[PDB]
C-alpha cells in the first residue's frame, strides 16, 4: 500500500503476530521474549487513551519500547536520562525503535 | 566435574576456616588449626594457649564452633577438639602474636627483641627472622630487619621451607605489620 505496514486502522485488528513479518529482527525479538511489569503498566496507559476508559498520558523513562499501532496519534513523554521529550507518533514510525526519536544529547560535530 | 579439580574444592574450605579462627581466638591466644578431613566428619583440633575460652563457660564457644563450620563445610557432622600449645616458641604463629602484644603496649622495637629473638633461638631453630613493616611509629614508611641463622638462602629452597606467622598489631596512630618467621630444625 503506503506507509510502514498497511492502512493504520486495518493493522490494529491484525495486530499480534502479523506485524512481525513486515519489520526487522529487533521488533520480532522484543515481542517474542516478553517484557517487564514496569512496561506492562504503560501498555495499559496507551490502551485507555486509544479506546475505552479515560486517558492516561504515557510517561515512560524506557526507550526499550518498539512502536505498536496503539501508540499512533498520541504524545509520549520519554525520559532520555535528562528530561522528558514529547514525541508524536506517526504511522511511518510503526515497527521502529522508541529511542531513535528523541535525542539524548545535543549532537553536533565537534569543533 | 573432574578429579583434577577435587584438590581445588576441598582445599578452599581449609583456607576459609584458617582466616576466621585466628581472629576470634585472640582471647585465648591462637597458634594453629590442625584440620583432619575425612568423609565421615571434619575433625578440627584447635591449638590454642588457653583451653578455657575455647571450650567457653558451659559450651558457649562450643555452640558457636558447631554452627560456624557447617556454613563453610560440606561436612555437616563437625566435631571439635582443643589441644594445648606446648611450645609457644617453636611456632611462628604464637611469636607473631606475642610480639604484637608487646608492640600494642608501646614496648619498643629492641626491647621486645629480648623475648622474641633471644628466647626463640634457645628453643631450637635452624633460623629465625623478625621483620617489622610500618612507619616505626613515625610519619613516613620504614622497615627494619633482624636476622639470625639460615632462613634466606639461594633459590626457593630454605626460605619456602619455613613456619610462618603474620599478625596485626593495631595502633591509634597507624597499623604495624608484624612478621615472625621461624624455620624449625631440618
Amino acid at each position: 500500500f503506503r506507509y510502514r505496514g498497511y492502512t493504520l486502522e486495518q493493522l490494529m485488528n491484525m495486530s499480534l503476530e502479523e506485524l512481525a513479518r513486515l519489520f526487522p529482527a529487533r521488533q520480532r525479538r522484543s515481542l517474542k521474549r516478553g517484557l517487564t511489569p514496569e512496561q506492562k503498566k504503560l501498555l495499559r496507559k496507551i490502551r485507555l487513551a486509544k479506546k475505552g476508559k479515560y486517558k492516561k498520558p504515557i510517561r515512560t523513562h524506557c526507550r526499550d519500547m518498539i512502536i505498536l499501532p496503539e501508540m499512533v496519534g498520541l504524545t509520549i513523554y520519554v525520559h532520555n536520562g535528562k528530561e522528558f521529550v514529547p514525541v508524536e507518533i506517526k504511522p511511518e514510525m510503526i515497527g521502529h525503535y522508541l529511542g531513535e526519536f528523541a535525542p539524548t544529547r545535543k549532537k553536533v560535530e565537534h569543533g | 566435574m573432574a578429579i583434577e579439580r577435587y584438590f581445588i574444592r576441598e582445599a578452599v574450605r581449609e583456607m576459609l576456616i584458617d582466616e576466621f579462627l585466628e581472629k576470634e581466638l585472640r582471647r585465648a591466644g591462637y597458634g594453629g588449626l590442625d584440620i583432619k578431613k575425612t568423609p565421615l566428619g571434619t575433625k578440627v583440633i584447635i591449638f590454642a594457649a588457653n583451653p578455657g575460652y575455647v571450650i567457653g563457660r558451659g559450651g558457649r564457644r562450643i555452640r558457636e564452633l558447631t554452627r560456624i563450620l557447617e556454613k563453610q563445610f560440606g561436612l555437616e557432622n563437625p566435631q571439635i577438639e582443643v589441644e594445648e600449645i606446648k611450645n609457644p616458641y617453636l611456632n611462628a604463629k604464637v611469636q607473631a602474636v606475642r610480639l604484637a602484644q608487646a608492640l600494642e603496649r608501646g614496648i619498643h622495637f629492641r626491647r621486645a627483641a629480648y623475648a622474641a629473638l633471644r628466647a626463640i633461638m634457645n628453643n631450637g631453630a635452624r633460623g629465625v627472622e623478625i621483620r617489622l613493616s610500618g612507619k616505626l611509629t613515625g610519619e613516613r614508611a620504614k622497615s627494619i630487619r633482624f636476622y639470625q641463622g639460615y632462613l634466606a638462602k639461594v633459590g626457593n629452597p630454605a626460605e619456602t621451607l619455613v613456619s610462618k606467622g603474620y599478625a596485626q598489631a593495631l595502633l591509634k596512630l597507624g597499623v604495624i605489620g608484624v612478621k615472625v618467621a621461624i624455620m624449625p630444625p631440618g
Binding site: - | 579439580r5 584438590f7 581445588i8 574444592r9 582445599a11 578452599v12 581449609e14 583456607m15 626457593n156
Partner: protein
C-alpha cells in the same frame, strides 16, 4: 497513610556484574570462576594451599 516499600530487583544474573567472591566481597579485580570462585588477589596467597605451584 504509610511509608513506602522498596526492594532489590537489579538483574544480576549475567556478566561480571553477576559475580562475586566469598573471600573479599567484591568482584572489581579480574575474577576467576572456573574451579574456585575467587579473584586474582585471593590467589596470591591462596594458590599454594590448593597445591598450585610457583615454579615453572
Amino acid at each position: 497513610m504509610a511509608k513506602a516499600d522498596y526492594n532489590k530487583r537489579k538483574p544480576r544474573k549475567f556478566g561480571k556484574g553477576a559475580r562475586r567472591c566469598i573471600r573479599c566481597g567484591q568482584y572489581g579485580p579480574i575474577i576467576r570462576i572456573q574451579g574456585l570462585m575467587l579473584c586474582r588477589h585471593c590467589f596470591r596467597e591462596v594458590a599454594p594451599k590448593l597445591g598450585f605451584r610457583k615454579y615453572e
